[PDB]
RNA sequence: CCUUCUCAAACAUUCUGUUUGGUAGUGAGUGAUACUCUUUGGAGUUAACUUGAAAUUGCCUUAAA
């Protein structure tokens, strides 16, 4: 059996979650959509996961878009067996729009003593 | 010692080894006399083989005494002594010295799109390239080597001789 | 003046210690700083004046070494109009325009291969600002793969003499360096073969003086790739 | 027989560029667009010189 | 009943991949008679008063297209389904598969020829291209050559 | 009546091309068959029976 | 149903438009503060200032089907130029100057002429008022004499003078004019219209170009084209 | 199926030298020792290298009909 989760790697650049939800909503009532975004930067990894409320539609969508040649690169859409849910995919964001002399002297002395190790 | 070198990067390895000196007498032995004629034009050491004029060959060798030679012509005429193409005899070379092979004694060592563009653009360097490639192929097939026979695919041999499509 | 005694000691101690390719040969100087450019990451390549034309030995070693680098000059549409090189002791390798880089290199593999070919990345100041959107991360992920800025325009028009004199000066004076938003900065120098001790001390003196003048540097250490951090100057008085 | 006007001008340009160095003319992609061999080059250049000294 | 060797056509490339292939081929349309004539006239006028990179164009003629095939010079082969003499194209997919060259089938010989000026072209091929050719070849493979590799079966 | 075919031959791929025809110079030369037409047009222009393209635009009265 | 390519293209275009708008707004905010210390430029220029000048603006179609963005959509709603091929006269000012860049990609601006303004006013005009859905044209000056004329704008010639001379009643008349819906260029389809549209589209790229630079000079073209 | 910020200012003017500003990037993944800060939370920085736009889970409609 195939689970409702759909694995699609090789996603086009800029193919955010909103576009995936909008396009897959045509096929029916999709459950959830998530994308693997890097913590350091919001740029995605070009691979994400999404789930459908119906397992039949889940594989129907993969069959229809199995090797569809979208702009940039084709979609590597695959369907996993029962289980393998969409657990844990966070929507990382960049950010909101926008005494000492003693330690330094000690470190300098330590470096001056250590340089003799050469 | 012998050096393991894949045919896909044989040209790159040879170019690096040549660039490692730029002057010292890096003696190299080639199985095919036609191949050296094609390799001489790839420097864009001097040509020294038996197929060319004997007088000019001798004069060039005398000048160099102050290379690019085949197995047969190197015998008796004489930093690194190397053999790239398969030897004319498996043991005549063993009798500094280093070897290159990858179909299968002392030790072993450890560790270019312009040519591809030009091969299809220059007619003469294309005819010479294919001539050398298939002369090396004939030498490899005609040689009764102990453990080397017709098995290796030419898909990498063509690349080794700068050729893209299989001739 | 910077302490020349420490430099004289280092030019012998470090040479003995080092005497793998970049670790043994690649000379560099590291300058400690107290933050930079606030909350911004402008990719401006700062230039430092060098008393010696270290580019000539750099290309001499590269010519005699396996790694042969190429100089790429990014130009504009008007610049297409061998005159761009006939007036240059120094020879430019390749000249390309931004028109091609934005489309003919859509394949990231080809873009990476093209970038790795060159090391002295030169570009017109007018088009330098638009480069990062084209060459991608890999070019800006290494100091030697990012575009350097050279002034070629004169009276808002192309000038062959302006390009020639500026490129000659850069080849016999300027040295690039990045501007990270951090407390550490690196300025590559050259190879172990570069000049002799006293000449090397003179070479480092101007670099250190310019670094001190340009900004309130914190400390500078004489260094070599993965070598011990030999102290040079202690500029804690600013703190 | 003689060389054509355009052919004569091309041969004169090649001779000025290289003189009698047919080997250099062979690799002269700027003028040797057809990749003339070392023999044809000299065969045409001798006839060109016959009328030019 | 059609034999297994026949009916390999009619089952052809999908809509999106076919459109992408047509768009890619349109980028290398051969110079037409009028354009070639005007270019030659301009060249003559320039030379008559006061040396170019090798051109690129799609291959369409059956004889020379097959000549490029077998020599491994054909990077991609596109074949029409509605060709009247089927025997002209029955062996072409087999030859392409034997030589290890990507191949594809399309519906409508006239649409095949519309991208090469001629009224009809039966088959078409490409010799040189920029980088989308590899992606198109992979898509064609995964959608026709590997998904329908069982063409030898059925009747 | 209804049996599948056998791909006994369409399972291995040839390496070397079936023929070793020598490479003709024309493939490496700029279309001498086209230089012929260029020179024919040059001759026609010299004879004056063919109008230069510029005069075509200059005479669109 | 809609194919995937359209959604991806719309998203890519929207991202670029939003980035350009944000960059332009951020640069203009710093320019207004007069700091002008770490920005590309502080001055303004036009090539082919914020001084007063009456200009004509035409709403052009394109770029690609970008979802209505808040800033540009609101700016257009202020001028009520949502419909394509619609134009209206606006008084150029330093405060209004950044609006050009804000809505530059969607509109084309230039300096009109007295003859062009007179012809446009006398050939087209709307008065959407007394149910009051009627699009009555400026048939007679009686409406101008009654509803207008409080400030002395009694006839169409007075409106022309106010528009060209930037009179006090310029705001009142401009709102009353219900800016004109200019006819589209080709205005057809079929055998000849397809080729005519294709031929005309080439000039659009060479005329309606956006450099997307934050300090890009104001795009200006002669209104004599139409 | 879509094209990326291809110069803004001052001295001086020698067919233009000097000075400043303007460059927020595809990710995946390896990695040779140091900088501080920041007050236990880890935050940014210093060489070099692989990549098929490869990849499995970090809390306004005449681009219409």
Numbering used by the authors:
A (entry chain o): 88 to 185, 195 to 214
B (entry chain D): 267 to 310, 316 to 337, 343 to 354, 359 to 375, 389 to 397, 411 to 417, 426 to 481
C (entry chain K): 31 to 49, 72 to 133, 138 to 144, 148 to 298
D (entry chain v): 175 to 227
E (entry chain G): 70 to 119, 125 to 203, 208 to 233
F (entry chain m): 239 to 299
G (entry chain t): 55 to 102, 136 to 217, 222 to 317
What does the paper behind this entry write?
Expression shut down of LSU rRNA domain I and III binder rpL25 led to similar effects on the pre-LSU folding pathway. Again, two major folding states, Nog1TAP_L25-A and Nog1TAP_L25-B, were detected in Nog1-TAP samples purified from cells where expression of rpL25 was shut down (see S4 Movie for an animated overview). Both were, again, characterized by the absence of clear densities for LSU rRNA domains III, IV and V and the 5S rRNA and their associated proteins including rpL25. Hence, their overall fold again closely resembled the one of the low-populated Nog1TAP-F state of the control sample. Only minor displacements of rpL25 main contact sites in LSU rRNA domain I (helices 9 and 10) were observed when compared with states of the control sample showing clear rpL25 densities. The factor and r-protein composition of state Nog1TAP_L25-B largely resembled the one observed in state Nog1TAP-F. On the other hand, in state Nog1TAP_L25-A several factors binding to LSU rRNA domains I and II and the ES7 element could not be detected (Ebp2, Brx1, Rpf1, Nsa1, Rrp1, Mak16) (compare Figures K and L in S1 Appendix). In summary these structural studies indicated that both rpL25 and rpL34 have a crucial role for the stable positioning of LSU rRNA domain III in nuclear LSU precursors. That effect is likely still increased in the subpopulations of misassembled particles for which numerous factors were not anymore detectable (Nog1TAP_L2-B, Nog1TAP_L25-A, Nog1TAP-L34B, see S1 Appendix, compare also with mutant LSU precursor populations depleted of factors in). These populations might represent newly made subunits with limited access to these factors, possibly through a delay of their release from accumulating misassembled particles.
To further decipher mechanisms of such an intrinsic quality control pathway we analysed here the contribution of three yeast large ribosomal subunit r-proteins rpL2 (uL2), rpL25 (uL23) and rpL34 (eL34) for intermediate nuclear subunit folding steps. Nog1 is part of a range of intermediate nuclear to early cytoplasmic LSU precursor populations and its association with LSU precursors was previously found to be independent of the ongoing expression of rpL2, rpL25 or rpL34. Structure models obtained from single particle cryo-electron microscopy analyses provided evidence for specific and hierarchic effects on the stable positioning and remodelling of large ribosomal subunit domains. The structural analyses performed here provide evidence for strong and specific effects on the yeast LSU precursor folding pathway upon blockage of the assembly of three different LSU r-proteins.
